[PDB]
Design a protein around this ligand. Structure first.
Ligand SMILES: Nc1ncnc2c1ncn2[C@@H]1O[C@H](COP(=O)(O)OP(=O)(O)OP(=O)(O)O)[C@@H](O)[C@H]1O
Ligand SMILES: C/C1=C/C(=O)O[C@@H]2C[C@@H](CC[C@H](C)/C=C\C=C\CC1)O[C@@](O)([C@@H]1CSC(=O)N1)C2
Ligand SMILES: [Mg+2]
Length: 363
């Protein structure tokens, strides 16, 4: 009687039942296999734990299920042992990436059915659900996850294909920068195990600089904005610079040898690429979702950043909910449990007559 909502991210899967206030599961989005030709698998955590004897791969690169057979594993694990449920008797909601390919979708679809024999299923735009979980039916989202960040302006519930912005800069690239400028402040973080740390150092300490400059040399001639962080065991390396400098990369891709424009930029471009009737609103309903959109004051930074690039008579709104980190899943949750939605599901039958193409016709 309960359907499922699996939000496939590049870094983390989020899964759960249609109706819970939060994803019952949220595990590493990796898959470990032995070493070679001769227990051929291990998803999420099992894989990390037993890493020492398997080589780990992420099956989703920048929002895209690129490693397929590995994914099937992942799904099987999510169901049968992350939810401990029978796919055959549970309708399934799958998150999807903006501009995700017809194929990459028809595949996903195919799978659920042919492989898992789910009863009915559906694929939804991440930013969209995410948006729906904030009230708005129309607006423009900023989804900066782990492997990518997008920009989606949506109209009365419809993402504006033409006007979408894909920025391959996200959490990891971001951690990587951190664990770079941290080996250069006199350390050595290079192995992946240091990453997960420099990463936790990230999630935790570092933040959003309002005025990059006055907040650069603000603590550049002071310790007042410094902090301590105990190493994996004992040490207390201090942070100062690396803090707002890490995220800052989101507003300044240069820092990574990235030619692309920063957030507020792409956000603007996007409104601007949207027929004028709506922008007024777009400016007004600017939603933030995604782990990396979790830094502090990034909220404000954007307020500023934007207004600066927009009509000095635009009512500009920033909406950065606390639940961001799972925004999507929830949206999926709600949308999934909706009566009327019950007609949106794509039953096997439907799928049996017409093919996997049946999915594209949405909402
Ligand atoms: N407070 C925080 N500040 C900065 N980054 C954070 C914070 N909390 C979590 N993150 C980062 O957000 C990322 C996880 O975000 P999220 O779950 O939205 O990504 P995903 O959905 O798995 O991947 P995708 O990019 O495909 O959407 C990690 O890179 C993590 O370090
Ligand atoms: C608490 C946690 C949060 C998170 O966001 O995890 C995601 C998923 C994680 C999986 C790979 C690692 C080795 C194995 C197990 C991890 C378990 C929990 C990780 O790889 C990330 O860390 C990468 C690496 S560094 C970064 O910025 N993204 C993001
Ligand atoms: Mg995601």
């Amino acid at each position: 009687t309960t359907a499922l909502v699996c939000d496939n991210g590049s870094g983390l899967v989020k899964a759960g039942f249609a109706g819970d206030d939060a994803p019952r599961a949220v595990f590493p989005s990796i898959v470990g296999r032995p070493r070679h030709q001769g227990k051929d698998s291990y998803v999420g955590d099992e894989a990390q734990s037993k890493r020492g004897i398997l080589t780990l791969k992420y099956p989703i690169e920048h929002g895209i299920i690129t490693n397929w057979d590995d994914m099937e594993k992942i799904w099987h694990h999510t169901f049968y042992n992350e939810l401990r449920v029978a796919p055959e008797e549970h309708p399934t909601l799958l998150t999807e990436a903006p501009l995700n390919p017809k194929a990459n979708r028809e595949k996903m679809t195919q799978i659920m059915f042919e492989t898992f024999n789910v009863p009915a299923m559906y694929v939804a735009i991440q930013a969209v659900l995410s948006l729906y979980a904030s009230g708005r039916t129309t607006g423009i989202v900023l989804d900066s996850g782990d492997g990518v960040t997008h920009n989606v302006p949506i109209y009365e519930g419809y993402a504006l294909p033409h006007a979408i912005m894909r920025l391959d800069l996200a959490g990891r690239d971001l951690t990587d920068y951190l664990m770079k400028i941290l080996t250069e402040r006199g350390y050595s973080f290079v192995t992946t195990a240091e990453r997960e740390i420099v990463r936790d150092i990230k999630e935790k300490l570092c933040y959003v600089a309002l005025d990059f400059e006055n907040e650069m040399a603000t603590a550049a001639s002071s310790s007042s904005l410094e902090k301590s962080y105990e190493l994996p065991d004992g040490q207390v390396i201090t942070i100062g610079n690396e803090r707002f400098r890490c995220p800052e990369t989101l507003f300044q891709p240069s820092f990574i040898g990235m030619e692309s424009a920063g957030i507020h930029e792409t956000t603007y471009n996007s409104i601007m690429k949207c027929d004028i009737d709506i922008r007024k609103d777009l400016y007004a309903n600017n939603v933030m979702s995604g782990g990396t959109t979790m830094y502090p004051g990034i909220a404000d930074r954007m307020q500023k950043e934007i207004t600066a690039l927009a009509p000095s008579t635009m009512k500009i709104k920033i909406i950065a909910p606390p639940e961001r980190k799972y925004s999507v899943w929830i949206g999926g949750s709600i949308l999934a449990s909706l009566s009327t939605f019950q007609q949106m599901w794509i039953t096997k039958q439907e799928y049996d007559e017409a093919g996997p193409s049946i999915v594209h016709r949405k909402c």
